[PDB]
From a paper:
Cobamides (Cbas) are coenzymes used by cells across all domains of life, but de novo synthesis is only found in some bacteria and archaea. Base activation is catalyzed by a phosphoribosyltransferase (PRTase). To gain insights into the mechanism of base activation by the PRTase from [name] (MjCobT), we solved crystal structures of the enzyme in complex with substrate and products. The protein fold consists of an eight-stranded mostly parallel β-sheet with connecting α-helices on both sides where the substrate binding pocket is built from the connecting loops and resides at the end of the C-terminal end of β-strands.
None of the structures described here contain a free base, although they were present in all crystallization experiments. This is true for the apo structure, which contains no ligands in the active site. Superposition of these two structures shows that significant changes occur in the loops extending from Ile 37 to Ile 45, Ser 293 to Lys 314, and Pro 333 to Tyr 348, such that the active site of the apo structure is open to solvent in contrast to that of the complex with either NaMN or α-RP and nicotinic acid. The rms difference between these two structures is 0.94 Å for 329 equivalent residues, indicating the significant conformational changes that occur when substrates bind. Strikingly, residues Lys 173 to Asn 181 that were disordered in the apo structure became ordered upon ligand binding and contribute to the distal component of the binding pocket for the nitrogenous base. Altogether, the movement of the surface loops serves to close the active site on substrate binding.
Author numbering:
A (entry chain A), B (entry chain A): 1 to 171, 182 to 349
Write the structure that this text describes.
C-alpha cells in the first residue's frame, strides 16, 4: 500500500509470493569520458558501475573506497538496493556488458568492451548478438520472477537516442540532445532502420541484454520488473520492436521510485503511454519522515534512482516488508560509518 | 537401473524429480605449457576448457573449430554433457577460475588469472578467498540440485598433489608424482599445514570454488553431485577439511562414468574410502552396443570423463532418460558433421 500503480493490469497479484532473482546489468560509455552528459565525476566514473554491484552483492565496494552514504545521510541508490537484498534475502547475480573496470565480485561477463562514441554514431556493432546472448542467458536462469536493474553512467542520454530513433516523442538536456541528434545523423538512421540499427548507433550495450533477458522470462510466462526509470522505458521500446506480442501478456512491468514517477521534466508516463498499456509501479520510502538531512531532503536536488533500487523496493514492499525498515537500515548504516 | 551405486545411502531418492542446475568450473595451469602432464596437445590446451563450456552451453565451440567427434565416431566428453543438456533441458551456467582463453558464451568470472606453477609450489595465493567467493556465489544460485563438473587440463596432477598433501594414500604417472612432490617440498608443506596452504601449493583454482559451491548447497539441505572422477575426490577431501560436519548430511555425491569406476590403476573407490562413506554413482552408456568404432571402443585407450559428463548422465538417467538416447544423439551428430 506504499506502492503507486498505474495501469496495474493485475500485475501485483502475479509477483506476490514469487521467489525473485535480482540482476543488475552494467556498462560504460566512451562518450562520458570527454562530454559531461553524466553527473558522475570523471575521476570515479570508470569505477562506479562495478562499485554499485559490489555493494549490492557483497555489502561494500572493493576499489572505490568512497562511503555509500555521504556526510549528510544521503544514500547512493545501490545502498537502497542492498537494503532490500539484505532485508528480504534476495538472491542476486550481476552482468557486465562493457564497464570500464570489472567487478571484483563474481559476475557474468557478456561483453568486455564498453559502449562506444554516441556522438559519432558508433555505440555498438553487435546489438543483435548481445540480444541473443541475453536471451540464451535468460533461458538458463531459474526464478519465479526477474527483477533486472541497470547501472550505466550516461544511460539517460543513450535512452534518449533510442527513444528518438524509434520515433517516439521524448523531450544540460540541451547537450544530451545534441549528442544523440548528431549520432543518429552520422549513422544515417532512417525510418527503414531496424531496432538493431538504432542500438548500434546510439544505444548502450545494457539495453539489448536486458531486452533479451526480459523476453526469455516473459515467453516462459514469468513476470519481469524492469527496475529503472527513463532508461528502462527505452528498453521497453526495444522490446516492443523485437517481440511486440509478448508485451501483451502483461508480464513485463516497470518499477521505479516515487521520486521518478513525479519528476517535473521527466514524464516517464508520457513515454510509456506512447509504447503501450504497460504496468508502471513506484515504491514509497517515506524518507521525509526521517531524522538525517540527506535522507529527509532526498526528494530534492537530483532525481534519485539507479541500480534497480525503485523496482526491487516495489517487490519487497508488495511482499510484506515494512517500508520504513529501508529508512532505518540506511540510518543504522549511516551511524556505523560515522559519515 | 543403468546406474552403478556404491554406498548409495538413499541419495538417488533425493535427486529424483529435482530441478537441477549444471555448472562447469574451468581453469588452466601454467605447468601444462612446458611439462606434458596433460594429454591435451600444446597447440589447443589454452583453448580447450572454454571450448568445452561453449559446446555445452551453446552447442558448438566458437574459437576451437576442431570437431567434437573425431573421424572414427569418438566423442569428446563435452559432447556427452551437451547430449544430456539438450535431451533433459538442463539449465546450465559456467564459471571461469583462470582459463588461459575466456569463453565467448556468457560465463561467471571468478578469477581471471590461471593456476600457477605446481612444481614451484606456486599454484595459488588466494585459495581461501576463492572458496568464499564460491560459497557466496553458491548462496545466490537457485536450484533444487547442483551438478558441478570441471574442465582443467592437468587437473589429475593437482588432484594428486592435494590428496597427497592432505595425507591420503594416492598412487606418465611417474612424472605427475615428481611435479607434486617437488611442489609440496618447495612450499614447505608440513602436517600443521592448513587445507588452504596445500591448495596454495599444488591445487588448481577450480577446487576451492567447487568446494565453496558444494558446501553452500549442502548447508541449505540441497543435494550436490560432484561430477568428475579423481579430480572430484580431491575436492571431497578439501570439503572434509573445511566443513567435516556437512559431509555427514549425505547430500554430496560423486557422479562419474562406468569407465572411471572400473579403471585398472585409478582406484577411485580406494580414495573415497579413506575420506568417508560418500555415495559414488556411475552412469552406464552401453557404447559397446553401438555401430561406429570410436563409440564402440570408447572404453579402451584413454580413461574417458570430463566436463561433468558422467555425473550429469547419472542425473539424467535416474530421471527417466533412456540411456541409449545419449548414444543415438552422438551418432546423429556424428553423421551430421560427416567426421
Amino acid at each position: 500500500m506504499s506502492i503507486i500503480a498505474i495501469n496495474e493490469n493485475g500485475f501485483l497479484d502475479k509477483i506476490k509470493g514469487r521467489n525473485p532473482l535480482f540482476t543488475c546489468v552494467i556498462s560504460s560509455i566512451e562518450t562520458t569520458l570527454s562530454i559531461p552528459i553524466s553527473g558522475v565525476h570523471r575521476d570515479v566514473i570508470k569505477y562506479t558501475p562495478s562499485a554499485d554491484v559490489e555493494l549490492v552483492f557483497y555489502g561494500k565496494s572493493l576499489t572505490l573506497k568512497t562511503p555509500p552514504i555521504d556526510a549528510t545521510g544521503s544514500p547512493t541508490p545501490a545502498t537502497i538496493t542492498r537494503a532490500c537484498v539484505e532485508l528480504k534475502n534476495i538472491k542476486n547475480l550481476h552482468i557486465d556488458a562493457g564497464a570500464f573496470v570489472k567487478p571484483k565480485i563474481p559476475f557474468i561477463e557478456i561483453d568486455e568492451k564498453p559502449t562506444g562514441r554516441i556522438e559519432e554514431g558508433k555505440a555498438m556493432n553487435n546489438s543483435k548478438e548481445l540480444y541473443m546472448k541475453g536471451y540464451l542467458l535468460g533461458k538458463n536462469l531459474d526464478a519465479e520472477l526477474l527483477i533486472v536493474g541497470e547501472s550505466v553512467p550516461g544511460g539517460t542520454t543513450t535512452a534518449l537516442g533510442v527513444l528518438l530513433g524509434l520515433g517516439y516523442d521524448a523531450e544540460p538536456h540541451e547537450l544530451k540532445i545534441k549528442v544523440v541528434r548528431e549520432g543518429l545523423k552520422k549513422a544515417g538512421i532512417n525510418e527503414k532502420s531496424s531496432v538493431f540499427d538504432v542500438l548500434n548507433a546510439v544505444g548502450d550495450k545494457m539495453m539489448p541484454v536486458v531486452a533479451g533477458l526480459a523476453i526469455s522470462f516473459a515467453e516462459r510466462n514469468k513476470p519481469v520488473i524492469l527496475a529503472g526509470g527513463t532508461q528502462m522505458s527505452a528498453v521497453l521500446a526495444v522490446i516492443k520492436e523485437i517481440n511486440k506480442k509478448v508485451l501483451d501478456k502483461n508480464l513485463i512491468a516497470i518499477g521505479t521510485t516515487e521520486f521518478v514517477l513525479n519528476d517535473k521534466k521527466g514524464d516517464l508516463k508520457g513515454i510509456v503511454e506512447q509504447i503501450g498499456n504497460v504496468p508502471v509501479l513506484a515504491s514509497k520510502f517515506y524518507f521525509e519522515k526521517a531524522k538525517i538531512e540527506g535522507l529527509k531532503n532526498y526528494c530534492k536536488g537530483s532525481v534519485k534512482e539507479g541500480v534497480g533500487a525503485g523496482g526491487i523496493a516495489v517487490y519487497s514492499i508488495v511482499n510484506d516488508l515494512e517500508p520504513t525498515k529501508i529508512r532505518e537500515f540506511i540510518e543504522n548504516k549511516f551511524y556505523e560509518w560515522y559519515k
